[PDB]
């Protein structure tokens, strides 16, 4: 609006269960480095450090509703908003064939 940006925030929590011989069907990417010098502070435009750079059409994540550009908020009950990339990758791998994840999709109206 006249006083600042307006956004639509859609929160999606999904349970992904994959087979051994497949991936969850997405590529995770960090939007910024995580340094211990200063905490990442979330904003509506930039709600988390990790996001879905791409999602395989027809894959597990896709069928559950995850989409390219979704920001990762939680992995298996743990907040990942401020967490660096390798650590988040480890947390996801810790679950094996099961991944519970909350994401947010942000659009500017
Ligand atoms: N587009 C793909 N699904 N490629 C394989 C997955 C790679 C991804 N970094 C995980 O692991
Ligand atoms: C977070 C990543 C380790 C997920 C992996 N690329 C997969 O599709 O299974």
Author numbering: 651 to 759
Task: Paste lines from the article.
As a model β-strand mediated PPI, we use the GKAP/SHANK-PDZ50 which, plays a role in the organization of synaptic protein complexes and has been linked to several neuronal disorders. There are >250 PDZ domains with several therapeutically relevant proteins known to exhibit their function through a PDZ mediated interaction. Class I PDZ domains bind to consensus sequences with a Thr/Ser in the -2 position from the C-terminus, with the C-terminus hydrophobic residue and free carboxylate being the main determinants of affinity. Here, we used dynamic ligation screening to identify peptide-fragment hybrids linked through an acylhydrazone bond, that are able to functionally mimic a β-strand and inhibit its PPI using GKAP/SHANK1 PDZ as a model interaction.
In all hybrids, the hydrazone bond existed in an E configuration with the aromatic ring of the fragment co-planar with the hydrazone. The N terminal glutamate of the wild-type GKAP interacts with R679, thus we anticipated that the carboxylate of the hybrids might reproduce this same interaction. However, the N terminal part of the hybrids showed different binding behaviour in comparison with the wild type sequence. In some cases, we observed multiple conformations of the same compound having different orientations of the fragments relative to the peptide component presumably allowed by the conformational flexibility of the linker region. The more favourable entropy of binding supports the hypothesis that linker flexibility leads to a “fuzzier” mode of interaction (see below) although the carboxylate exhibited a slight preference for interaction with R736 which differs from the wild-type GKAP peptide (see above) and likely arises from a combination of hybrid flexibility and the propensity of R736 to engage in effective charge-reinforced hydrogen-bonding interactions. Although this leads to slight uncertainty about the exact location of the fragments, we hypothesize that the key carboxylic acid moiety moves dynamically across a positively charged patch formed by R679, R736 and R743 on the protein surface, making transient charge-reinforced hydrogen-bonding and cation–π interactions which is also consistent with a more favourable entropy of interaction.
